[model samples]
Target: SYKFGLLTIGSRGDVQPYIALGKGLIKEGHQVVIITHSEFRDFVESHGIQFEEIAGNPVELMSLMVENESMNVKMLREASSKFRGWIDALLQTSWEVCNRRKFDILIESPSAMVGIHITEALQIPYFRAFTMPWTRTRAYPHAFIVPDQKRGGNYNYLTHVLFENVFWKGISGQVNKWRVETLGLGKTNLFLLQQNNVPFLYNVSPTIFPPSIDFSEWVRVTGYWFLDDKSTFKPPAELQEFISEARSKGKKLVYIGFGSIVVSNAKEMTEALVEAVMEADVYCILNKGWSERLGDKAAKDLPRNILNIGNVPHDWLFPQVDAAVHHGGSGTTGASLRAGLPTVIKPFFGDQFFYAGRVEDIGVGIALKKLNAQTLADALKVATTNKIMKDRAGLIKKKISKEDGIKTAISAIYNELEYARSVTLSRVKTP
Candidate 1:
């Protein structure tokens, strides 16, 4: 069995699918190690996978990204300056870990961009794995740049090209210095991996968002890599009582939480959520989240129907709720869709908008154009009461349930590696 290194960097949502993938690898008799922020060490180790700590905080990363969304030059420069040490440390530690672990195969969330460079240095095979479409395609714009206005295929493809260049350029200086100084490699570009024919496995269900016909053969769409914890997860007693009471009263239960998307004004967002839940007359479980984006101040005087909650496993809780409203992080979106809940997405950034639009397009959810009490209330009402949307969600759940995403991904990885080996052997023989 292969020793697999799964490296990812981002919020909990970003790390989750990789962990699920790691667990699957372990079950298949492969040794899997996940390298990420220190915060997720327990989370990874709890699932019986090995863990490695990286130098960064997902919350701080999100804070920087959210502030730079509109691109004020002053703050962007400050942000860039602040990230220099973080980036350098990331590169240093990443090299240290990969060198120490010496994995046969490396799979990475392209967000970190370290795996590609490490694999290149190690002369090992690598694959880009993600919860959304990161590769170039004529089908849609880059996840970070999906716009409100419509654009044609040309614009769509260019976003992918430009976004990759933009992202790489942001870190190329440090990366190249590290490559030469530490890895003893020449300067390389992010796009070089694509040119060298690396396979990209998207852990998204084709039933939800079909792969573009324009995509090449190497880009594979495995289903969502969902790590189910329902069997062992026990809900908080208060939450259990609330659910039971809601069910007894025949009240529709709705879940409201932005997974990790932190808005600048927490108070206003919280107030809006409370007002909407009250207006919709739905029993809502409001997740306070890591940032406390939804806090006690605004929700303290809330009616009995609205309950404030901390983190609860989506896999355990989603099936109990009638509908969900969230930031549309890929993992949360996957969980909600898997449970067949009608969704309302208030997209904050990146792939959230893409998923929001897709959820609306597929008729299982609503993409909020404006976020306020009235709009949220209307969305909640429609999500809970609409028959067609609920039915569509149920159909999607059925499809997702039938998929073994990890099995498919592992098979693809093995097949691609064998093909690469065969070609390498033939070249050596010919030479």
Candidate 2:
């Protein structure tokens, strides 16, 4: 049996896909474990995979950095103060979980930035696993950049280097110091961190964001690592009643949930959202806060047109909705699009804006730059009434319907390891 060590950080959006991958690997008779925040221990272990809790709460860390505020030097200073300790903990935690595990491969997300260094230090094969496309390619600009105009390939390539430099400089001092004192290695930066040949597995669906042709064979664009929660998720009786009531009345039902961006004005946000649903003449189920905000106690005694759901699995809930309105997060966006629901992307920061671009370009959704009762109502009007967008979403869903991302990703891993074994055997032959 193979031992696979997967490392990640972030909120559920960042860790969910890896949990699905780890669960799949375990089903294939391999021992798989993931290293992540302590808050996710139950979520990870619920899938029957081994888990190791590390320091720092990524959800809390990200919550500290406001959406638009993560732009300039201000972000680094703000982030470094809170995040530096986590980075240090990440280094130590990975060493403890992975150093002697003798894993066949090391899988990582961008948040676990030091995984490359740790794997290199141990001379293990490193694999890339991320929700976004970060591989160097001229097909488009890096996800970090907020592009307003179509630029040349040179500009695209430079954008990547710039983002890389930003990331490298952020924690270079800490990484370099750790290298010398703890890992017994010399200083190294991000550019050359994985210069040696290593396969990259971008855990995103080409249906959502098409893959680039410029990348080499080393990069495999697996379809989105969608977590198909097989564990039966029974919707609340209220939810079931709401769906039946909406269907009986032949009203469209919409699901609204923003994974992270919480406005202090929850009352105002709810009013605007509920107003949109009423104006659109549809039933609505709103998940207050990102994930399980108040455990079903957050919103009670809501209007007849809207229902407050705590944390129903999107994999199960989205199928019952006609459309969705929320931030352009990896998990939410992908789940909504894959469910063949016309979406309204209200982006805040990071790659979310980029995803909004894709949603617009593909004609499957409306990317709303502003959100208010009337503005969101306008966007929802288009999302619900436009047959063109609905048809396009259906086509995209059909395109990726057969995607077994976890299974295909494991096949790719096996291919790489088998290739290595064959090469090793060939070299050992003697005359």
Candidate 3:
């Protein structure tokens, strides 16, 4: 029996898709193991899957980023300053896992490129599950519309090209060199390995990022691997009451959350959001998670129209809301799209700004440069009431929902398995 392993790093957003895909693989009678931060042990085991815990937590990495408005920096700088250490930690942990587990096929998040080393060393097929466009250098051509630089200098293309060639390539080379020395792998070619001559899975719908780039036959747009909440969570009574109260008063609500890693001034942002929602004459639900104390004085003084809670599954909360405001992470973006809710994205760093820009350009949402009373209010107004935005979001939602990413990915993996088996049989017969 062939064993499959899924490796990921970062937040719950990074881990959740693997869980969904792992669950699907388990149902298909495949043995699956998930290697990630130790904190996710409960999350993984609870789903009735085997878990292998790693040392570092991406949450802590995120906290470090937020310590100095690091999230607002360019992706390249953010990687060097905030993410490099975590990548080192990940490489160490992944090497340990590789030494111990005999995995046949390995699937990994783009962030955890160390999977390439393990896969190459073990002679296993490695598949990349990209949660953002930044994962693929070739995806640049299709990412955003930019005028040709030769004609008048399209700053967007220039920036994209710089990020791909100078920034990302440099980082990849550094990581590759480290891997080669540490693992004693000969002649490491980072780009060739990363741009794997194997099928790479993207977790976004082609409807949003239509295939406009030239990629090898290996890259496959398998669509978004949406999490299935399926009523597994029930909101607290107080949250329910807040939703009902807003409905009774004819007030529409928008949900605002920035995932876990990006929030710095949670209290300040919450206060600004509450005021902005009130100013826009809309109610708001703030998913504070573990970052902000919901009962803090700042939150306590908020108007009744604003609700603060520790957490709510986006799958459940989003459908009931008219719009969403967030950091533009691919997972949250996918959730908002599936819910058919117009979005207001206030991106801080990484690929978030790219996704936000795409959403706004596509008319499915509004992208704000930053979060504050004025921008939040204006964005909320555009997202909540704009018929065009709603229609576009609805159409995209339908497209995303029809995509069975987990199933498609499983089929791809199984196809590879069958091909491998066929090769083995042919080799034996020829001998």
Candidate 4:
């Protein structure tokens, strides 16, 4: 019976989980509104959830954040300034949306960085929810700046601090200014102010990245928030035909795509991928172009075995595919893993590398360090041919499928609320 405002920003991978969570909340008799980029308005409204627009082009911001170029002071200054402006606008619009309605609780992907301040201004309970691991722990390195080799748990814990400060310091100037002028709140660092006081809901499968024992009880590992669209989705006729034909021929089908990630060497990468498919002798449904126009500049036309595709719902397609090769976006990785498909992750940037490492560590797939025809072909061959890898993936699939992440997340939220209430009551009685 409470109004919950869910705020997140970024690509479809980032926003889709919140929409699923909102729908789950709505089913539980709470009014939920998802606030994010304008691009996702129709996508959000299509799910019958209330939608609000926050300022900033997520695609542009992603491009800036994932710029695959050598960094210099000049580029750094310009990018920082751009981020400041974007953060300012996002903060302003987030405030506008929250002020427009009196929300009982605010749940947000901490990437937005406006939730804590807005909730502070509005005096409502707030929860940090995300697909990626955010909180500091001795378990592993933070996703953004993963090291090439393991440097012990102590080093892993510091990676979180490194990233937190790098991110907080980058926008603290604009954030503090907005806090004082717009939100009428005193300047304070979000991490320093809240520390472990705020509850965190990590929307990831516990099977994949097991929760660290070092984490406090406030950090809950809710399973992947998958939007259940399998029954309703009808795959394109051509895609269906392709799958059926490949199946009839007893050919293994591999899916290759880099969801929303822009790579610098698109042309050469495409050529390498095309040749790799040929080397592996498997039919592939290539997500032709998401961010960087993949498959556009192949040396020759794609072989008949490689069907260039735009976008097919992974939930529908992953089950049919024998294996998957992707950029390790959390949603896509979850979908592939949930389908019991042996995965090969050629990470491009950010958390992609982290998830790729997990896939390899789990014995379900290969974490490709470099992309060449031989390397990709070797990965594809191993992914499809290795029975142990397939079984491991199936085991993981069973665990992930059994998890009702949405239900767990809602329960966690309510439990936290109740726990906080009881603690306040105890304090009042003692006083």
Candidate 5:
């Protein structure tokens, strides 16, 4: 059996996909180990999978940094400011883990691309997995053309040209230096290191990303992996009764939830959401997760038609809702699409904005720039009642349901394993 290692950083959005992939690998008769934050150890172990706790809570780190008034203002002023220190910390942690346990192959999230260094040092193949389109090479062409920031941006024609150049150059330089010092490698080109010949697996649907990107050959858009908590989820009787009551009255309910990571002004966001749903005259169910600040006052004050729930699986709940409104996290976006419901995405940061843009571009949802009552209501009305949005969402859902991401990714991994074995055998014969 092949032994593979999966390394991911960040919140539930980052960890859940790897867990889904790990389950797939385990079922395929492979041994898989997941290295992530300590908090996720219980969740990962609950699946009967091996887990290793890594350094730093990516979500907590970003949240704490952004909580500072100056840092918060800077983050809002400059989008790339959010990634500065966290990337370096991630690189250091990944290097430590690699030194601790050597595996046959390494699979990592785009944010944790530092795994490439370990794989290169061990001479094993590594795959970069992304939950959104932001990591796709085509999304940022400057990554290829302007390999060196000090000399390249003036010639490129892309918008945000300079920003993209400096952004990648700065981050990639640090990563490369760490690799060189830690692995004792010779002088290496930043361009080659940044554009290392590693294959990528995109966890989003191809429907969202255009096929014209040049590096499409090395990337596989394996659709979205909608994680199901079939073994653990059991909806409450009250919720079931509420759904039945709504159906009887011909009033459809919408699911409104942002996954566990984003903890912005949740109180204000939830208040705005309540007003929006009330104005639209629809029943709503909100998932008030542990991390977000949905207090007792807000819970008790909710309208009769609105239900504030603590937790429920998206895979189980989305199908029963009329539509979904969320922060456009990869997991939430995938669940909304899988349910064949139109969506309203109010993104906060990172790859979320990318998913929002794609959903709007595909006509599956209305992406609201702000999450206040006015904007949320406007987007919700269009998504739930507009003919174009309904048709587009249904069409996209049909397409997404046909592609099995888990199976496709497993096939790719096995194919890579077979190819690696063949190459090794050939080398043995050659000598």
Candidate 6:
């Protein structure tokens, strides 16, 4: 069996899709090693995927990466800081993982950029995948930069290069250092980095970010990689009781959960969201996330209509909610849409703004340019009362449900591997 090493570093939102993908690979009789943060060992191992701990807590690392700058500046800085020794220990630890593991192939998420160099040094196949839009295409700028124009232009295309450099330079320092020290290789410019040509797998919904003709044939836009199914998610006792109460009241259930993003003023934001839910007269399922940004204190003395629920699978909860709101994280956005729930998208950071805009553009959700009680409350009223938007949400949900993203992605990887072997053998015969 070919040993496939899936390298990802981030929160549950980042690691989860890989777990789903790993399960698919395992079913095909391949050995899948999920290399991620130490905290993910339990989550990964529990999913039956082999867990190899990579150094550094991404949450803390993310904090340092964006400690400075406004959400916009933090956007560029966070993307750049992650690749450098700027965060202190990520690259060194990543190198150690590569040094220890022996694998035939690497399935690398963009967060673990070091895997690109590692697989290069090993002369093995490096397969690239991300839940976000990373490729440099004229279709639109990198997801982070809010474009001034609706029409794509050279300016839009160049933004990708600009942001790419920001990211490359940010990590290039640590990358160059690691390459010289561990791989016994010379430093290379990140700008000159070539696409691996092993299908650039984008595990996101084509319905959300449709491809432009300008993109290469190798770029594959598959649907979202969702792990939990309807039957698999068992709600916590507290959440169950809350759901029962909401159902008994016959009031609309609206979910407010930001998957990550330590919101700038979470307490104030929580109060605003609570007010919005109250004004809409909907029962709210508030997810006080791992960041604890929306702290338990905010939920303390909450109205009976709002339940401050901790982490629960979106697969189970989204279907139960009439509407959802969040920082527009790709996973959360995708999950809510797939559940046929309308949304109120309030983006906080990279690509989130774009996802929020897509939600608005599709007419199934309201994208808030600003977050506040009045803004959110008004948006909630619009999001729920619009029957046209509800119809759109149902259509999109049907489309997403019919998609098997894991199956599509695995097939692409297999095809690429076969072609790679052919090319490798042809080169060997050239001698």
Candidate number achieving the greatest TM-score relative to the actual structure: 4
What TM-score, over all chains together, does every model reach?
0.91, 0.89, 0.82, 0.92, 0.81, 0.88
lDDT of each: 0.83, 0.77, 0.71, 0.83, 0.70, 0.77
- Per-residue lDDT tens digits for candidate 3, residues 1-431, read 55888888777888888888888888888899999988889998888778987755756554443455345457558567656676677777788887689888888775666766666656666777776654334435323333222222244435555554554465665567666777666544435443434457787777766554555545667777766875689778998898898889988888987755434556676678777988899988877542342223323376778777766888899999899988888888888988999998877667776788778777899888767899888888888888888999999888888888888877767766644333323222132
RMSD per candidate (Å) reads 3.3, 4.4, 5.5, 3.4, 5.9, 4.1
| Winning candidate number (lDDT) | 4
- Candidate number with the higher lDDT (3 or 6): 6
lDDT tens per residue, model 4, 118-211? 7777667788887776789988788887888667898888999888889888788888999889988778874445545678899999988899
* Residue-level error in angstroms, candidate 1, position 91: 0.6
Local lDDT at 200 for model 2: 73
Off-target runs (Cα >4 Å) in candidate 5 are 68-93, 134-181, 186-189, 194-196, 260-268, 289-300, 416-431
Per-residue C-alpha lDDT of model 5 across residues 189-241, encoded as one tens digit per residue: 43545432456777777777554455545567787765678557788988998
Reference-based lDDT, residue 95, model 5: 75
lDDT digits (tens) for residues 88-134 of candidate 6: 47666666776677788788887667766776666667777887767
Q: For residues 199-247, what per-residue lDDT tens digits would candidate 1 score against the true structure?
A: 7788989887688898877788999888888899777789989999999
Model 1: pairs clashing at backbone N, Cα or C within 3 Å: none
Greater lDDT among 4 and 5 belongs to 4
| lDDT: worst 10-residue window of model 2 | 422-431
Clashing pairs in 5: none
Ranking by TM-score: 4, 1, 2, 6, 3, 5
- What is candidate 3's CA lDDT for residue 199? 57
The clash count of every prediction, one per candidate, is 0, 0, 0, 0, 0, 2
In terms of lDDT, model 2 sits at 0.77
For candidate 2, what is the TM-score? 0.89
